[PDB]
Symmetry: C3
Subunit: 263 residues, 3 copies
């Protein structure tokens, strides 16, 4: 059902079954499939394709030539009715592609809220993007990639399948990420390696001087002490008993499946 306060341009094609919220705006030459939900205040500028089982939240801005909900590029996918979920207040720029999940991968591609996805960013099947993230121009996620809250990924950078980009990470431009990046780390290169703690991001986001120091000490345990990860995990858990921000490392280790980026 199309809310009476929504605008649908006469040249747009909204298929019966689509749900369009109050004060949404569907611009010229858009296509919206029958299983799409578009939340209140969301704008599709023009020439946008949204299809599949796809739920989009409120106050998003989706620009021309973006493709949301489309068939993914996994050769294992065979047309099953998988899903895309997108949250609120995202800016989804020209030519961005966000593909539906695969049965094998859990069936869901998810994007949170307040993200900036720049021109031609790619979010593959079964990815999970959190909140307040930035993907710069042409940043490309392979299938099953996680991008955690506040992480930023620079222009022209690609991330290999299943990798985790931890919270508050900064991945430089022109990089290739082949393994998991722990929270709070700067990564860059091809393949990307660690380059210290994203101190400036943490400072701007309200982290205390004590928390940043504890995070830097956790980084040194991982990358400078010379100990194995298994030896380091209890020491990081010990540090998190005083500095709760360090618990992000613990939670990340439990999810990591590709090993950490290394020098």
């Amino acid at each position: 059902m199309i809310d009476k306060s929504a605008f649908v341009h006469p040249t747009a094609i909204v298929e019966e079954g689509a749900s369009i919220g109050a004060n949404a705006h569907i611009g010229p030459f858009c296509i919206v499939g029958p299983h799409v939900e578009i939340g209140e205040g969301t704008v599709l500028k023009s020439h946008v394709v949204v299809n599949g089982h796809t739920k989009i939240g409120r106050d998003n801005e989706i620009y021309q030539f973006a493709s949301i909900g489309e068939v993914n590029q996994d050769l294992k996918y065979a047309g099953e009715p998988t899903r895309v979920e997108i949250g609120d207040r995202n800016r989804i720029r020209e030519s961005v592609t966000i593909h539906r999940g695969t049965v094998q991968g859990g069936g869901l591609t998810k994007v949170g809220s307040d993200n900036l996805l720049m021109i031609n960013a790619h979010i593959a099947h079964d990815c999970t993007v959190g909140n307040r993230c930035i993907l710069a121009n042409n940043a490309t996620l392979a299938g099953h990639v996680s991008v955690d809250d506040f992480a930023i990924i620079g222009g022209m950078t690609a991330v290999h399948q299943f990798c985790i980009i931890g919270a508050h990470v900064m991945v430089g431009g022109c990089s290739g990420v082949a393994q998991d990046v722990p929270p709070y780390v700067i990564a860059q290169g091809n393949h990307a390696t660690p380059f210290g703690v994203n101190i400036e991001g943490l400072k701007r986001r309200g982290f205390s001087r004590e928390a940043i120091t504890a995070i830097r000490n956790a980084y040194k345990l991982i990358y400078r002490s010379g100990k194995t990860l298994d030896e380091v995990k209890p020491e990081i858990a010990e540090l998190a008993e005083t500095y709760p921000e360090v618990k992000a490392f613990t939670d990340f280790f439990a999810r990591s499946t590709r090993g950490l980026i290394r020098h």
Copy 2:
């Protein structure tokens, strides 16, 4: 002529002269020029531009914002009526560009069958793509590039003009290819260098243990023996007298014009 069983969306523009086969589907806001042939069962999802002297085979799927047959980017091109040929059962994803040939280059851009061309892949004027190939997101071919059967090219990778990507090659992501890549080789880096034989691809595609060993021995002749290519060519031809798969090297050497990628 438009076959009576083809579907042409009321908002699509199919110019008189275009040939549309049985059970083809031209989606909304597509444009199909007067010299285009579209084979049986081929689907243009929406917002596709196909123009020029362009013949497309059967059962292809061409996604939104793709541009097929368009004027190429060679400054030497001046509007001559050159051609594009595309075979069967290709999946041509969002924003892919396939440009027409140049008179100087032979007049033809050719793509075979069963290929996967991912988001924003680029096939320049006078390229030749074989069968069962994959170009990952943003993979970019300069003019006159050959991509032989079963070769795969990773995300964000670019190939310099006139290079040959041999059969069953794997080119890693985030690479720049500046010379010719012999069949069966793994290449990666900027500039790309050889990294052994694509053993896993050959195994999955039915190559025998004996054939793979012979191919690996041919690789060692080229890259490990320390002999010159001219010295190695007869030894590889000798090996191909027993192992016919090795003949692919011989055929590749006759076409190569930029020298081989090297350590």
Copy 3:
């Protein structure tokens, strides 16, 4: 006002207020905003979006899925009425994006004349592109970048914010430019470093043997003499008293704010 000799396709949307010059051509499914000026002979092929306060000159060719004048990607931008200016005889290929300026950056994104902007090139807010430039596929400028006359930027290359690409520069493909590139230099790598003088470009563009030698001597002063830039600046000014082409270095030094690319 739309000139009586301009063609506007029935499916295009040209908003009242737009100015369309003689013998211009607005193709199907284009959108042209009320503050756009399109000069005589300019062609929008199809599926082009032009909006914002945007002035486009004569005899340009703008291809499908390009976005010209759009809101930029700077988080500091808040909708102010900034501008785009584009000159004459540019070829602006599929999926190119040219974004409007920011108040903080001077309010203007500017492109000159006779440029080739290949598929998915990006010109960010407040950039300045001169005349006779080439941006190859996926070449990406961050905000505030200058690309001076005759410079060429290879495929997949990105330029960090505020950098200057000097006149007659050649930046290789697959590169990342993080600092300023003096006129006449070849740059490549990640990060890009200098690789001599773009002698072949200068030769083709009519530079004398004496001018090229003087330019090469200026390059050696900067990169081989071992002197500091401040020591070298007067020696280059001294050389320009005889060879006026060397004055380009002087003018570039006065604009440079990020230091020069270095070995």
